Design a binder for this molecule. Structure first.
Ligand SMILES: *[C@@H]1O[C@H](CO)[C@@H](O[C@@H]2O[C@H](CO)[C@@H](O[C@@H]3O[C@H](CO[C@H]4O[C@H](CO)[C@@H](O)[C@H](O)[C@@H]4O)[C@@H](O)[C@H](O)[C@@H]3O)[C@H](O)[C@H]2NC(C)=O)[C@H](O)[C@H]1NC(C)=O
Ligand SMILES: *[C@@H]1O[C@H](CO)[C@@H](O[C@@H]2O[C@H](CO)[C@@H](O)[C@H](O)[C@H]2NC(C)=O)[C@H](O)[C@H]1NC(C)=O
Ligand SMILES: *[C@@H]1O[C@H](CO)[C@@H](O)[C@H](O)[C@H]1NC(C)=O
Lengths: 49, 49, 77, 146
């Protein structure tokens, strides 16, 4: 699975729950799950379709 | 982190202390068993809520 | 303070919500007698003894927060 | 088993606020020690024959941190925990421009609602920079290996 951890909760551009401000911890598997990448970094939304 | 691909059930645990975020798993030690065992000590700066 | 390149143009692919499909029951409560999901002592193991340990642990028989992943739509290839 | 060590800018003026039982703003909203772990405090100064370190613009700390609820009548006090950070840190910048700076932000109803505010104070840069180190040890949290 993929994990998202933080300390701030807010709404998206459409008002739906899920936005996490500031630094956020992300756990994500890759390479068909062989790699287990983790990072507590800053995430920024995109404004596309 | 590297985990070999297989078809064996496993376990994972996550917690936090003042040291940081501790990640526990059974893939490092107890492959055929299943128990928590220390593999990751993420140096987090803030408390996760 | 790191690096990392963006993959493609800012045009995300479409995402749907079909959580009614994902709603199903596969109850797997944890059995502590079956030794599922117990945090080991962090640096001091033991052997062949029965010992009381105070720490962070789950309740016996919790339905939990079971989640399931699914594949996307596809027509042929 | 492990050695944890925090460094910060700490001049001599609030040295008497370094006590655990002190009720000053440093122990109120800035930093609190571990009651259950052995601690050491070091207050040091930049040597003249040492150019490998720099100094901040000015010292700054937080004198007020509380939560305003959505009812506009109830204020919840905040307490700093052991090696933890107050939510007011998320709205207070690292360098405070001037004394009496007031910072405010909106709190979501999932996080209790209302607003979060804080107030800070600044101390002018003296001739030489003084800093503080906090040393805390852990004996059994990992393999005893330092
Ligand atoms: C998929 O993974 C590949 C290998 O892990 C990625 O290549 C790496 O991409 C990451 C960013 O995504 C970067 O690795 C970073 O390294 C920096 C410091 O290294 C930089 O400097 C050295 C020389 O000093 C240079 O050789 C590197 O290329 C970096 O420019 C760290 O601060 C980061 O935390 C991170 O580890 C590199 O760009 C690159 N490294 C290597 C060894 O190939 C690949 O980019 C990933 N996929 C995508 C789409 O990004
Ligand atoms: C681990 O502890 C058990 C419990 O005492 C030991 O097993 C006992 O050994 C005696 C010796 O004859 C038997 O009479 C008991 O019936 C055994 N009890 C059980 C539950 O097996 C065992 O020897 C110990 N093992 C080690 C390696 O110390
Ligand atoms: C966290 O994010 C909010 C909103 O983006 C911002 O107002 C605040 O200053 C940020 N705090 C930190 C410490 O980055």
């Amino acid at each position: 699975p993929a994990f998202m951890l933080g300390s701030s909760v807010g709404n998206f551009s459409d008002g739906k729950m899920g936005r996490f401000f500031n630094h956020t911890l992300v756990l994500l598997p890759d390479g068909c799950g062989t790699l287990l990448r983790a990072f507590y970094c800053i995430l920024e939304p995109r404004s596309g379709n | 982190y590297n985990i070999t691909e297989d078809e064996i059930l496993e376990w994972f645990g996550i917690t936090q202390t003042a040291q940081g975020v501790h990640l526990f798993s059974s893939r490092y030690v107890d492959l055929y068993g299943g128990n928590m065992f220390q593999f990751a000590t993420l140096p987090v700066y803030d408390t996760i809520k | 303070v790191d690096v990392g390149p963006d993959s493609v143009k800012s045009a995300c692919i479409e995402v749907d919500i079909q959580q009614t499909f994902f709603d199903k029951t596969w109850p797997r409560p944890i059995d502590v007698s079956k030794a599922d999901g117990i945090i080991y002592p962090q640096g001091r193991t033991y052997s062949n003894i029965t010992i009381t340990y105070q720490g962070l642990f789950p309740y016996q028989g919790d339905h939990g927060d079971m989640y399931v992943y699914s594949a996307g739509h596809a027509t042929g290839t | 088993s492990s050695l944890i060590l925090d460094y910060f800018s700490y001049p001599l003026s609030m040295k008497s606020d370094l006590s655990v039982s002190s009720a000053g703003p440093i122990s109120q909203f800035n930093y609190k020690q571990s009651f259950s772990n052995p601690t050491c405090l070091i207050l040091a100064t930049v040597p003249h024959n040492l150019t490998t370190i720099t100094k901040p613009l000015k010292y700054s700390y937080i004198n007020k941190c509380s939560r305003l609820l959505s009812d506009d009548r109830t204020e919840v006090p905040q307490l700093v925990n052991a090696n933890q950070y107050s939510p007011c840190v998320s709205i207070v910048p690292s360098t405070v421009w001037e004394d009496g700076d007031y910072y405010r932000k909106q709190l979501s109803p999932l996080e209790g609602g209302g607003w979060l505010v804080a107030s800070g104070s600044t101390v002018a840069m003296t001739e030489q920079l003084q800093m503080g180190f906090g040393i805390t040890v852990q004996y059994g949290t990992d393999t005893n290996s330092v």
